[PDB]
């Protein structure tokens with residue numbers, strides 16, 4: 469009778485995710501409205517993700533000391549305010565700063581929201597909620613760009629931010645009445661020296677770092693495609709909004725297909741064999757995209773096929789590498805999760821920006837060549853990581 473709590477956390481999580489996914493196709497309308505160059509399109513996502521890594525390391529220990537309730541509720545409010553505030557941005561620089569401020573809201577989901585879930589419910593009921601949250605993460609990158617392309621076809625980009633704020637408001641009120649206080653160290657002081665030392669400690673573990681870096685590198689081509697596909701397809705190939713959306717279907721559908729095969733194979737395959745199994749489509753897909761576009765710069769259908777094959781591999785291999793990276797360090801899971809989360813976002817932010825310059829200077833060929841080296845770096849780390 470009190471399932472309002474995990475339900476409203478799912479709603480909030482969903483809203484921060486479309487806070488990125490719906491926005492990207494709208495970015496072409498944003499830069500036209502500010503009369504800014506196309507180079508600002510991928511940067512919207514870069515700033516959002518950079519904000520997502522800013523406070524990651526702090527919120528867990530802090531909410532443990534002052535309460536999961538006030539910290540979680542504060543994050544929801546912060547998202548509401550920054551979503552509305554971007555309506556007042558006067559140039560693309562100001563717009564990009566607010567994307568960064570919005571992205572900080574991402575830190576509250578894992579470090580305090582999910583921490584509260586694990587502390588409240590039975591381990592059997594905890595699996596049901598976790599699975600549901602995983603479903604949302606899988607559905608957002610498919611539906612997001614589709615709904616976002618449909619939105620700006622009829623409605624202003626500003627309207628999307630009003631929608632994000634509204635969904636988060638509903639989420640606030642449910643959390644305000646249903647979230648219990650579960651923080652275990654209320655009243656205790658926080659030492660930033662002890663906290664910083666815990667992070668130096670996790671980063672000393674070479675096998676943990678290899679796994680965490682590998683997760684960043686291997687996912688980068690997907691994230692770069694989310695960031696840049698509007699300018700690649702619409703301004704680069706001179707195609708329509710409809711085709712932009714159509715090309716998302718084989719890519720994110722393959723990702724889903726990869727995850728469903730994972731579920732069917734899990735009882736009769738170890739984590740290690742699934743990573744190796746995914747490596748074939750990961751490497752072949754990225755090779756196909758690169759070879760085709762070097763031969764012919766405008767072979768965007770070959771590019772899309774290569775990325776779908778690669779995306780299938782990710783669906784099969786990623787969750788297993790997450791699990792193994794998590795247990796590669798014997799330290800507290802709060803510290804480990806936050807560390808691996810920050811390492812992968814560091815790669816995403818820097819990688820998208822490199823990817824942007826690669827595309828601007830050399831087109832689809834360079835875009836896909838850079839994705840290929842990221843695949844090679846994942847593979848290089850797995851030869852070491854797996855033993």
Ligand SMILES: O=C(N[C@H](CO)[C@H](O)c1ccc([N+](=O)[O-])cc1)C(Cl)Cl
Nearest residue numbers: 484485488517574605687690786812
């Ligand atoms: O895009 C992915 N998701 C992972 C983890 O969910 C990635 O770390 C990520 C996290 C948050 C995010 N966002 O809300 O902007 C995007 C990617 C795929 Cl690699 Cl599954």
Ligand SMILES: [Pr+3]
Nearest residue numbers: 662663665666
């Ligand atoms: Pr310490």
Ligand SMILES: [Pr+3]
Nearest residue numbers: 659662663666
């Ligand atoms: Pr400690």
